[PDB]
Coordinates of C-alpha atoms and ligand atoms in Angstrom, one line a residue:
Chain S
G17 CA -24.7 -7.6 27.8
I18 CA -25.4 -4.5 25.7
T19 CA -27.9 -2.8 28.0
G20 CA -26.3 -0.2 30.2
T21 CA -24.0 2.7 30.3
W22 CA -21.0 2.9 28.1
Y23 CA -18.1 5.5 27.9
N24 CA -15.9 6.3 24.9
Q25 CA -12.4 7.6 24.8
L26 CA -13.6 11.2 24.5
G27 CA -15.5 11.2 27.7
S28 CA -18.9 10.8 26.1
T29 CA -21.7 8.7 27.8
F30 CA -23.8 6.2 25.8
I31 CA -26.9 4.9 27.8
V32 CA -28.6 2.2 25.9
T33 CA -31.3 -0.5 26.2
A34 CA -31.1 -3.5 23.9
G35 CA -34.7 -4.8 23.1
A36 CA -35.5 -8.4 22.9
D37 CA -36.5 -7.8 19.2
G38 CA -33.2 -6.2 18.0
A39 CA -34.1 -2.6 19.1
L40 CA -31.6 -0.2 20.5
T41 CA -33.0 2.8 22.5
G42 CA -31.5 5.3 24.8
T43 CA -29.6 8.6 25.2
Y44 CA -26.2 10.0 24.1
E45 CA -24.2 12.8 25.8
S46 CA -21.3 14.1 23.9
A47 CA -18.2 15.5 25.7
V48 CA -17.2 17.4 22.5
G49 CA -18.8 19.3 19.6
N50 CA -22.0 21.4 19.3
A51 CA -23.8 19.4 22.0
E52 CA -25.3 19.9 25.5
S53 CA -27.0 17.5 27.7
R54 CA -28.7 14.3 26.4
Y55 CA -30.0 13.4 23.0
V56 CA -32.3 10.7 21.8
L57 CA -30.7 7.7 20.1
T58 CA -32.3 4.8 18.3
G59 CA -30.6 1.8 16.6
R60 CA -30.7 -1.9 15.8
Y61 CA -28.5 -4.9 16.8
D62 CA -28.3 -8.6 15.9
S63 CA -30.5 -10.2 18.6
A64 CA -29.3 -13.8 17.6
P65 CA -25.4 -13.3 17.1
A66 CA -23.3 -16.2 16.0
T67 CA -22.3 -18.4 19.0
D68 CA -18.9 -18.9 17.2
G69 CA -16.5 -16.4 18.9
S70 CA -17.5 -13.2 17.0
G71 CA -18.9 -9.8 17.9
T72 CA -22.4 -8.7 17.8
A73 CA -23.2 -6.3 15.0
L74 CA -25.1 -3.1 15.7
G75 CA -25.6 0.6 14.9
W76 CA -27.4 3.7 16.1
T77 CA -28.2 7.2 15.2
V78 CA -28.3 10.5 17.1
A79 CA -29.8 13.5 15.4
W80 CA -28.2 16.5 17.3
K81 CA -31.4 18.3 18.3
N82 CA -32.9 18.3 21.8
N83 CA -34.7 20.8 24.0
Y84 CA -31.6 22.9 24.4
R85 CA -30.1 23.2 20.9
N86 CA -29.9 22.2 17.3
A87 CA -26.6 21.5 15.6
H88 CA -28.4 20.6 12.3
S89 CA -26.4 17.4 12.0
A90 CA -26.6 13.7 12.8
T91 CA -24.2 10.9 13.6
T92 CA -24.3 7.3 13.0
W93 CA -22.2 4.7 14.8
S94 CA -21.6 1.3 13.1
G95 CA -19.8 -1.5 14.9
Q96 CA -19.9 -4.5 17.1
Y97 CA -20.2 -5.5 20.8
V98 CA -17.8 -7.9 22.3
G99 CA -18.6 -9.4 25.6
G100 CA -16.5 -10.8 28.5
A101 CA -14.6 -9.4 31.4
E102 CA -13.4 -6.6 29.2
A103 CA -16.6 -5.8 27.3
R104 CA -16.3 -3.3 24.5
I105 CA -18.3 -1.8 21.6
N106 CA -16.0 -0.9 18.8
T107 CA -17.3 1.6 16.3
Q108 CA -16.7 3.7 13.2
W109 CA -18.9 6.7 12.8
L110 CA -20.2 9.2 10.3
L111 CA -21.2 12.7 11.3
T112 CA -23.2 14.5 8.6
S113 CA -24.2 18.1 8.8
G114 CA -26.9 19.6 6.7
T115 CA -25.3 21.6 4.0
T116 CA -25.9 23.7 0.9
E117 CA -25.0 22.1 -2.5
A118 CA -21.9 24.3 -2.8
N119 CA -20.7 23.0 0.5
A120 CA -21.4 19.3 0.0
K121 CA -17.6 18.2 0.3
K122 CA -17.8 19.3 4.0
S123 CA -20.9 17.4 4.8
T124 CA -19.5 14.2 6.3
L125 CA -16.9 13.6 8.9
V126 CA -15.7 10.1 9.7
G127 CA -14.0 8.8 12.9
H128 CA -13.9 6.0 15.4
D129 CA -15.1 5.5 18.9
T130 CA -14.3 2.7 21.3
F131 CA -16.8 2.2 24.2
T132 CA -16.1 0.5 27.5
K133 CA -18.1 -0.1 30.6
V134 CA -15.4 1.9 32.6
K135 CA -14.9 5.7 33.3
Chain A
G17 CA -40.8 15.4 2.5
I18 CA -38.8 12.5 4.0
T19 CA -41.9 10.2 4.6
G20 CA -42.4 7.9 1.6
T21 CA -41.0 5.1 -0.5
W22 CA -37.4 5.6 -1.8
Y23 CA -35.1 3.6 -4.0
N24 CA -31.3 3.8 -4.4
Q25 CA -29.2 3.3 -7.4
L26 CA -29.0 -0.5 -6.7
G27 CA -32.8 -0.9 -6.8
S28 CA -33.1 -1.3 -3.0
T29 CA -36.3 -0.1 -1.4
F30 CA -36.4 2.2 1.6
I31 CA -39.9 2.7 3.1
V32 CA -39.9 5.3 5.7
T33 CA -42.0 7.5 8.0
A34 CA -40.6 10.7 9.6
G35 CA -42.2 11.2 13.0
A36 CA -42.9 14.8 14.2
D37 CA -40.3 14.4 17.0
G38 CA -37.4 13.4 14.8
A39 CA -38.0 9.6 14.6
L40 CA -37.4 7.6 11.5
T41 CA -39.1 4.1 11.3
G42 CA -39.7 1.9 8.4
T43 CA -38.4 -1.0 6.4
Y44 CA -35.5 -1.7 4.0
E45 CA -35.2 -4.3 1.4
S46 CA -31.8 -4.7 -0.2
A47 CA -31.2 -5.6 -3.9
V48 CA -27.9 -7.1 -3.1
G49 CA -25.9 -8.9 -0.4
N50 CA -26.9 -11.5 2.2
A51 CA -30.5 -10.4 2.5
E52 CA -34.0 -11.3 1.5
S53 CA -37.3 -9.4 1.8
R54 CA -37.8 -6.5 4.4
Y55 CA -35.8 -5.6 7.5
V56 CA -36.8 -3.3 10.3
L57 CA -35.1 0.1 10.3
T58 CA -35.0 2.9 12.9
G59 CA -33.3 6.3 12.9
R60 CA -33.4 10.0 13.5
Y61 CA -33.6 13.2 11.6
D62 CA -33.4 17.0 12.3
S63 CA -37.1 17.9 12.6
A64 CA -36.3 21.6 12.7
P65 CA -33.7 22.1 9.9
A66 CA -32.2 25.4 8.8
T67 CA -33.9 27.4 6.1
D68 CA -30.9 28.7 4.2
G69 CA -31.2 26.0 1.6
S70 CA -29.2 23.5 3.6
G71 CA -30.2 19.8 3.5
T72 CA -31.8 18.0 6.5
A73 CA -29.4 15.7 8.4
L74 CA -30.5 12.2 9.1
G75 CA -29.4 8.6 9.7
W76 CA -30.8 5.1 10.3
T77 CA -29.7 1.6 11.0
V78 CA -30.8 -1.8 9.7
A79 CA -29.5 -5.0 11.5
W80 CA -29.7 -7.7 8.8
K81 CA -31.8 -10.3 10.8
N82 CA -35.4 -10.9 10.0
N83 CA -37.7 -13.9 10.0
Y84 CA -36.0 -15.5 6.9
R85 CA -32.3 -15.1 7.6
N86 CA -29.6 -13.4 9.7
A87 CA -26.4 -12.0 8.1
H88 CA -24.9 -11.2 11.4
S89 CA -24.3 -7.6 10.2
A90 CA -25.7 -4.1 10.4
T91 CA -25.5 -1.1 8.2
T92 CA -25.9 2.6 9.2
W93 CA -26.7 5.3 6.6
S94 CA -25.6 8.9 7.3
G95 CA -26.7 11.7 5.2
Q96 CA -29.2 14.4 4.3
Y97 CA -32.5 14.9 2.6
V98 CA -32.7 17.6 0.0
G99 CA -36.1 18.8 -1.2
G100 CA -37.2 20.6 -4.3
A101 CA -37.9 19.5 -7.9
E102 CA -35.8 16.4 -7.7
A103 CA -35.8 15.6 -4.0
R104 CA -33.3 13.1 -2.8
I105 CA -31.4 11.6 0.2
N106 CA -27.7 11.4 -0.3
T107 CA -25.9 9.1 2.1
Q108 CA -22.6 7.4 3.0
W109 CA -22.9 4.0 4.8
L110 CA -21.0 1.8 7.0
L111 CA -21.8 -1.9 7.0
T112 CA -20.3 -3.8 10.0
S113 CA -20.2 -7.6 10.3
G114 CA -19.7 -9.5 13.6
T115 CA -16.1 -10.7 13.5
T116 CA -13.4 -12.4 15.8
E117 CA -10.9 -9.8 17.2
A118 CA -8.4 -11.2 14.6
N119 CA -10.6 -10.3 11.8
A120 CA -11.6 -6.7 12.9
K121 CA -9.9 -5.3 9.8
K122 CA -12.4 -7.0 7.5
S123 CA -15.3 -5.9 9.8
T124 CA -16.5 -2.7 8.2
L125 CA -17.3 -1.8 4.6
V126 CA -18.0 1.7 3.4
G127 CA -20.0 3.0 0.5
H128 CA -22.6 5.6 -0.7
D129 CA -26.2 5.4 -1.7
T130 CA -28.4 8.0 -3.3
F131 CA -32.1 7.6 -3.0
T132 CA -35.0 9.2 -4.9
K133 CA -38.7 8.5 -5.0
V134 CA -38.5 7.3 -8.7
Chain E
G17 CA 10.1 14.2 11.7
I18 CA 8.0 12.0 9.5
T19 CA 11.1 10.3 7.9
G20 CA 11.8 7.0 9.7
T21 CA 10.6 3.5 10.7
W22 CA 7.0 3.4 12.2
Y23 CA 4.9 0.6 13.5
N24 CA 1.1 0.5 14.0
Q25 CA -1.0 -1.2 16.5
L26 CA -1.0 -4.5 14.5
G27 CA 2.8 -4.7 14.3
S28 CA 2.9 -3.6 10.7
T29 CA 6.1 -1.8 9.6
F30 CA 6.1 1.5 7.7
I31 CA 9.5 2.7 6.4
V32 CA 9.2 6.2 5.0
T33 CA 11.3 9.2 3.6
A34 CA 9.6 12.6 3.6
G35 CA 11.2 14.6 0.7
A36 CA 11.7 18.3 0.9
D37 CA 9.3 18.5 -2.0
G38 CA 6.3 17.1 -0.1
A39 CA 6.8 13.4 -1.3
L40 CA 6.6 10.3 0.7
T41 CA 8.4 7.2 -0.5
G42 CA 9.2 3.9 1.2
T43 CA 8.0 0.4 1.9
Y44 CA 5.2 -1.1 4.0
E45 CA 4.9 -4.6 5.4
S46 CA 1.6 -5.8 6.8
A47 CA 1.5 -8.0 9.9
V48 CA -2.0 -9.0 8.6
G49 CA -4.0 -10.0 5.5
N50 CA -3.2 -11.2 2.1
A51 CA 0.4 -9.9 2.1
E52 CA 4.1 -11.1 2.6
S53 CA 7.2 -9.0 2.7
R54 CA 7.7 -5.5 1.6
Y55 CA 5.5 -3.5 -0.8
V56 CA 6.2 -0.1 -2.4
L57 CA 4.4 3.0 -1.1
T58 CA 4.2 6.5 -2.4
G59 CA 2.4 9.5 -0.9
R60 CA 2.4 13.3 -0.2
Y61 CA 2.5 15.5 2.9
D62 CA 2.3 19.2 3.7
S63 CA 5.8 20.4 3.6
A64 CA 4.8 23.8 5.1
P65 CA 2.5 23.0 8.1
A66 CA 0.7 25.7 10.0
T67 CA 2.7 26.8 13.1
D68 CA -0.2 27.0 15.6
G69 CA 0.1 23.5 16.9
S70 CA -1.8 21.7 14.2
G71 CA -0.7 18.3 12.8
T72 CA 0.9 17.9 9.4
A73 CA -1.6 16.4 6.8
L74 CA -0.4 13.5 4.8
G75 CA -1.5 10.4 2.8
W76 CA 0.1 7.4 1.1
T77 CA -0.9 4.4 -1.0
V78 CA 0.2 0.8 -1.1
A79 CA -0.9 -1.5 -4.1
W80 CA -0.7 -5.0 -2.6
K81 CA 1.4 -6.5 -5.4
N82 CA 5.1 -7.2 -5.2
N83 CA 7.4 -9.8 -6.6
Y84 CA 5.9 -12.5 -4.4
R85 CA 2.2 -12.2 -4.4
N86 CA -0.7 -10.1 -5.7
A87 CA -3.9 -9.5 -3.6
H88 CA -5.5 -7.3 -6.3
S89 CA -6.1 -4.6 -3.7
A90 CA -4.7 -1.3 -2.5
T91 CA -5.0 0.7 0.6
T92 CA -4.7 4.5 1.2
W93 CA -4.0 5.9 4.6
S94 CA -5.1 9.5 5.3
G95 CA -4.1 11.4 8.5
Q96 CA -1.8 13.6 10.3
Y97 CA 1.8 13.6 11.8
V98 CA 1.8 14.9 15.3
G99 CA 5.2 16.0 16.6
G100 CA 6.4 16.4 20.2
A101 CA 7.7 13.9 22.7
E102 CA 5.8 10.9 21.5
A103 CA 5.6 11.6 17.8
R104 CA 2.7 9.9 16.0
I105 CA 0.9 9.5 12.7
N106 CA -2.9 8.9 13.3
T107 CA -4.7 7.7 10.2
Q108 CA -8.0 6.4 8.8
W109 CA -7.7 4.0 5.8
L110 CA -9.6 2.7 3.0
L111 CA -8.7 -0.8 1.5
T112 CA -10.2 -1.3 -2.0
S113 CA -10.2 -4.8 -3.6
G114 CA -10.6 -5.1 -7.3
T115 CA -14.1 -6.5 -7.7
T116 CA -16.8 -7.5 -10.3
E117 CA -19.9 -5.4 -10.7
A118 CA -21.8 -8.0 -8.7
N119 CA -19.5 -7.7 -5.6
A120 CA -19.4 -3.9 -5.5
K121 CA -20.6 -3.8 -2.0
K122 CA -17.6 -5.6 -0.7
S123 CA -15.1 -3.4 -2.5
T124 CA -14.0 -1.0 0.2
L125 CA -13.1 -1.6 3.9
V126 CA -12.5 1.3 6.2
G127 CA -10.4 1.3 9.4
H128 CA -7.8 3.2 11.4
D129 CA -4.1 2.8 12.3
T130 CA -2.0 4.6 14.7
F131 CA 1.7 4.7 14.2
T132 CA 4.8 5.4 16.5
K133 CA 8.4 4.8 16.1
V134 CA 8.4 2.4 19.1
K135 CA 8.8 -1.4 18.9
Chain T
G17 CA -6.4 2.1 -20.0
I18 CA -5.6 4.3 -16.9
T19 CA -3.2 6.8 -18.3
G20 CA -5.0 9.9 -19.5
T21 CA -7.3 12.6 -18.4
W22 CA -10.2 11.9 -16.0
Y23 CA -13.1 14.1 -14.8
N24 CA -15.2 13.7 -11.8
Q25 CA -18.8 14.7 -11.2
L26 CA -17.6 18.0 -9.6
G27 CA -15.8 18.8 -12.8
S28 CA -12.3 18.3 -11.3
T29 CA -9.5 17.2 -13.6
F30 CA -7.3 14.2 -12.9
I31 CA -4.4 13.7 -15.5
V32 CA -2.4 10.7 -14.7
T33 CA 0.3 8.4 -16.0
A34 CA 0.2 4.7 -14.9
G35 CA 3.8 3.3 -15.1
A36 CA 4.4 -0.3 -16.2
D37 CA 5.7 -0.8 -12.5
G38 CA 2.5 0.1 -10.7
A39 CA 3.3 3.8 -10.3
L40 CA 0.6 6.5 -10.6
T41 CA 2.0 10.0 -11.2
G42 CA 0.3 13.2 -12.4
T43 CA -1.7 16.3 -11.6
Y44 CA -4.9 17.1 -9.9
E45 CA -7.0 20.2 -10.3
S46 CA -10.0 20.5 -8.1
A47 CA -13.2 22.4 -9.1
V48 CA -14.0 23.0 -5.5
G49 CA -12.6 23.8 -2.0
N50 CA -9.5 25.6 -0.9
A51 CA -7.6 24.9 -4.1
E52 CA -6.5 26.6 -7.3
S53 CA -4.6 25.3 -10.4
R54 CA -2.9 21.9 -10.5
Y55 CA -1.3 19.9 -7.6
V56 CA 1.1 17.0 -7.6
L57 CA -0.4 13.6 -7.0
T58 CA 1.3 10.3 -6.6
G59 CA -0.2 6.8 -6.1
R60 CA -0.1 3.1 -6.9
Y61 CA -2.2 0.6 -8.8
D62 CA -2.4 -3.1 -9.4
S63 CA -0.3 -3.7 -12.6
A64 CA -1.5 -7.2 -13.1
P65 CA -5.3 -7.2 -12.2
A66 CA -7.4 -10.3 -12.3
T67 CA -8.7 -10.8 -15.9
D68 CA -12.1 -12.1 -14.7
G69 CA -14.3 -9.0 -14.7
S70 CA -12.7 -7.4 -11.6
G71 CA -11.7 -3.8 -11.5
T72 CA -8.2 -2.7 -11.1
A73 CA -7.3 -1.6 -7.6
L74 CA -5.7 1.8 -7.0
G75 CA -5.2 4.8 -4.9
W76 CA -3.4 8.2 -4.9
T77 CA -2.7 11.2 -2.6
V78 CA -2.7 15.0 -3.2
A79 CA -1.3 17.2 -0.4
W80 CA -3.0 20.5 -1.1
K81 CA 0.1 22.7 -1.4
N82 CA 1.4 24.0 -4.6
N83 CA 3.0 27.3 -5.9
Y84 CA -0.3 29.3 -5.5
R85 CA -1.5 28.2 -2.1
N86 CA -1.5 25.8 0.9
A87 CA -4.8 24.5 2.4
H88 CA -2.8 22.4 5.0
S89 CA -4.7 19.4 4.0
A90 CA -4.3 16.2 2.0
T91 CA -6.7 13.9 0.2
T92 CA -6.4 10.1 -0.5
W93 CA -8.6 8.5 -3.1
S94 CA -9.1 4.7 -2.9
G95 CA -10.9 2.8 -5.6
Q96 CA -10.7 0.9 -8.9
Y97 CA -10.5 1.4 -12.6
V98 CA -13.1 -0.4 -14.7
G99 CA -12.6 -0.5 -18.5
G100 CA -14.9 -1.2 -21.4
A101 CA -17.5 0.7 -23.2
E102 CA -17.8 3.4 -20.5
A103 CA -14.5 3.4 -18.6
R104 CA -14.6 4.8 -15.0
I105 CA -12.5 5.1 -11.9
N106 CA -14.9 4.6 -8.9
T107 CA -13.5 6.0 -5.7
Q108 CA -14.1 6.9 -2.0
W109 CA -11.8 9.5 -0.5
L110 CA -10.7 10.8 2.9
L111 CA -9.7 14.5 3.2
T112 CA -7.6 15.1 6.4
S113 CA -6.9 18.7 7.5
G114 CA -4.1 19.4 9.9
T115 CA -5.7 20.1 13.2
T116 CA -5.0 20.5 16.9
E117 CA -5.7 17.5 19.3
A118 CA -8.8 19.5 20.4
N119 CA -10.2 19.6 16.9
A120 CA -9.6 15.9 16.1
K121 CA -13.2 15.1 15.4
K122 CA -13.2 17.6 12.6
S123 CA -10.1 16.3 11.1
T124 CA -11.3 13.9 8.4
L125 CA -14.0 14.3 5.8
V126 CA -15.3 11.4 3.7
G127 CA -16.9 11.3 0.3
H128 CA -16.9 9.6 -3.1
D129 CA -15.8 10.6 -6.7
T130 CA -16.7 9.0 -9.8
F131 CA -14.2 9.6 -12.7
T132 CA -14.9 9.3 -16.5
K133 CA -13.1 10.2 -19.7
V134 CA -16.0 12.5 -20.6
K135 CA -16.4 15.9 -18.7
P136 CA -19.6 16.0 -16.5
Ligands
LIG201 O1 -20.9 18.9 16.6 C1 -21.9 18.4 16.3 O2 -22.4 18.5 15.2 C2 -22.7 17.6 17.2 C3 -22.0 16.7 18.2 C4 -21.0 15.6 17.4 C5 -20.3 14.9 18.6 C6 -19.3 13.8 18.0 S1 -20.3 12.4 17.3 C7 -18.8 11.5 16.9 C8 -17.9 11.8 18.1 N1 -18.1 10.8 19.3 C9 -18.6 11.5 20.3 O3 -18.8 10.9 21.4 N2 -18.6 12.9 20.1 C10 -18.3 13.2 18.7
LIG202 O1 -24.6 -8.7 3.0 C1 -25.0 -8.3 4.1 O2 -24.3 -8.4 5.1 C2 -26.3 -7.6 4.4 C3 -27.0 -6.8 3.3 C4 -26.1 -5.5 3.0 C5 -26.7 -4.7 1.8 C6 -25.9 -3.4 1.6 S1 -26.2 -2.2 2.8 C7 -25.2 -0.9 2.0 C8 -25.7 -1.2 0.5 N1 -26.9 -0.5 0.1 C9 -27.9 -1.3 -0.2 O3 -29.0 -0.9 -0.5 N2 -27.5 -2.7 -0.1 C10 -26.1 -2.8 0.3
LIG203 O1 -5.5 -8.3 2.5 C1 -5.1 -7.5 1.7 O2 -5.9 -7.2 0.6 C2 -3.8 -6.8 1.5 C3 -3.2 -6.5 3.0 C4 -4.1 -5.4 3.7 C5 -3.4 -5.1 5.1 C6 -4.3 -4.1 5.8 S1 -4.1 -2.4 5.1 C7 -5.0 -1.7 6.4 C8 -4.5 -2.4 7.7 N1 -3.2 -1.9 8.3 C9 -2.2 -2.8 8.2 O3 -1.1 -2.5 8.6 N2 -2.6 -4.0 7.7 C10 -4.0 -4.0 7.3
LIG204 O1 -10.5 22.3 0.6 C1 -9.4 21.6 0.6 O2 -8.8 21.3 1.8 C2 -8.5 21.2 -0.4 C3 -9.3 20.8 -1.6 C4 -10.2 19.5 -1.4 C5 -10.9 19.2 -2.8 C6 -11.8 18.0 -2.5 S1 -10.7 16.5 -2.6 C7 -12.2 15.4 -2.4 C8 -13.2 16.1 -3.5 N1 -12.9 15.7 -4.9 C9 -12.6 16.8 -5.6 O3 -12.3 16.7 -6.8 N2 -12.5 18.0 -4.8 C10 -12.9 17.7 -3.4

């Protein structure tokens, strides 16, 4: 249920493949920020989730460097997949930018993204 | 550089290899929590970082399932590598557990880990 | 403005008064968790926000102890007030529980709440 | 245990009074960022913690406006006070800057501060 294309509330596109082993691989295209086109993403997910009515834990990372540009930053998403007729991946994220010591307070932004199979 | 064996303030062990094209692969062993032995990790890092003294951005994930146990959770670490005399990786992490929709509020813990090669 | 009765997506009720001095005072009643009835809250907000369309920064805290129960925990909400037709307060929160050294990992939960005066 | 002067690893100064009623009141002076001098802070803490080794839950907010300047931002610290030999207040914080809807992703920074009774 995780493999496929996902869309978040910002208009971004998350293309992922969930491996039989627990591997998450794919590309991410952000609708906002210092980003253009697709970026590599890699992550992990619980490949044997509880069959007791709970989501499937997972996470992935995107370093914002590709053949077109480098934002010198990286974002990690942490959350869970919930299946069904209204599938969704609910996440909280941390976007860290490389900084000088003097600027360490500005290194990490926090937010949340909800992904659905629609849009 | 990033490639090597690191330890955080809890005594956890982070063994990682930084690929030339931005990949991070390795193993993680936590000193605390619902975990035992090593777990697979994968991530990404800026392989062409700025040269103005700024750290190198990076991140990685561990899903807490291995051959011995499964905690039905996953942690992501977001941070940066800083070289020099006392090289370190400063991170903030999010640990999400699979939950019911009703328990979503208890789903994600937040913290911070600092790693050094010592 | 900020003064008023707000509700978030969980059904919790946030009753607040924004003082001319930048203070936030009021009560909070959570629809979920280890809580019952009203709890005291206090916080601060920018009483001279920018005039370029930016939101008004604010934050408040609730320690989860009142005359009826004590959860040995406290939550802080950080966010901004957005005026206009549909006024809203968008927040990210941290819920810290008192813990022993051994349970440090479980000390702080992070989430997000959106409030409106509707309900 | 809580009332008094605290310093974080950045050298910021947190002077607070914990009321018998759960109130936290005081001043905060940041060593970094768009700030100068002292700012008003208000917060709350558990006035009857578990006497079992557990810390004392608490939190406070500073809106970064005072008589000298206004950064149009506010920080909330969430954490717990731990007494004993080496007393500390361990916290995680969220700093939200007022932004337009278009700059939402850049609205909230996250970090951590460890406060001690002895300057860094
Ligand atoms: O600006 C940058 O440093 C690189 C792009 C960051 C895009 C962020 S990642 C968190 C959020 N979710 C998205 O889909 N886009 C933004
Ligand atoms: O309890 C669990 O669900 C799985 C183990 C979590 C270990 C956490 S990950 C964040 C922190 N850093 C560590 O090295 N260990 C803990
Ligand atoms: O369980 C507890 O420790 C005390 C109650 C916490 C209720 C949380 S605070 C963050 C979120 N928003 C709400 O309105 N309720 C929950
Ligand atoms: O730059 C600003 O918007 C206002 C000042 C922010 C100072 C931050 S609050 C979190 C961290 N802890 C400190 O003591 N100082 C910085």
